[PDB]
């Protein structure tokens, strides 16, 4: 997260850390007690998932869990066309008993529109080029589909939307993929991709457009 700050501890209780050999490679979002959304480009043959976390380096905070997940499924149209349909569902090997610090979040029942006020969180790169230990949070605003399609020419697809791009240079970055973009209090997107470097003036980040996938998600959950 570029130009954010430490999140208030446990204020984003749906945040999931995806780690391998205790090293984070992506985040995800808890959407049901047994189900974590993430970017399809974060797919692995298995996962260790940190839930209820604030710090990655600290001792087990009260309420935190490290849970295994051995099953996941990418959207059938992922990367067709390139970068599009960037979501997958990870099924936890055990359902989590939701608690004060581990909670699911619902997906928005409305698609993004320019001006929507959002928050993105993650453990990805900071403005200073370092990786944080503590979960970071920053505010970004949705821009219009036309802005997104111009900026991300030639690869804009309706499975994507854009947020950020302000003169404030607030953005997601490497390591934030799969994490939540919460707009008006609902899960609106997952961190997906952007231009390098992150945090350029006038260049928003790109997020998976979850309002387009609610039927696929729930069909998969219920199968």
């Amino acid at each position: 997260i570029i130009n954010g700050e430490d999140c208030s501890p446990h204020s984003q209780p749906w945040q999931a850390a995806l780690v391998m050999e205790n090293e984070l490679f992506c985040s995800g979002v808890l959407v049901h007690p047994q189900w974590v959304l993430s970017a399809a480009h974060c797919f692995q043959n298995s996962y260790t998932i940190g839930l209820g976390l604030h710090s990655l380096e600290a001792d087990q905070e009260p309420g935190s869990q490290m849970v295994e997940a051995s099953l996941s499924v990418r959207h059938p149209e992922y990367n067709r066309p390139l970068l599009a349909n960037d979501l997958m569902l990870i099924k936890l090997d055990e359902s989590v008993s939701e608690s004060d610090t581990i909670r699911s979040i619902s997906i928005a029942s409305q698609c993004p529109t320019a001006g929507n006020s959002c928050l993105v969180s993650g453990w990805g790169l900071l403005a200073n080029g370092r990786m944080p230990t503590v979960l970071q949070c920053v505010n970004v605003s949705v821009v219009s589909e036309e802005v997104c399609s111009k900026l991300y020419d030639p690869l804009y697809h309706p499975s994507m939307f854009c947020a950020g791009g302000g003169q404030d240079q607030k953005d997601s970055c490497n390591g934030d993929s799969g994490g939540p973009l919460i707009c008006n209090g609902y899960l609106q997107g997952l961190v997906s991709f952007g231009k390098a470097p992150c945090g350029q003036v006038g260049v928003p980040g790109v997020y998976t457009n979850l309002c387009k996938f609610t039927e696929w998600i729930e069909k998969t959950v219920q199968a």
């Binding site: 992506c26 480009h41 960037d86 990805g124 490497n174 991709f193």
Partner: peptide, 14 residues
């Protein structure tokens, strides 16, 4: 120039 924002990221020629 586009990169999928995992760490390490997945970057493309554009």
């Amino acid at each position: 120039g586009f990169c999928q924002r995992s760490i390490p990221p997945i970057c493309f020629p554009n």
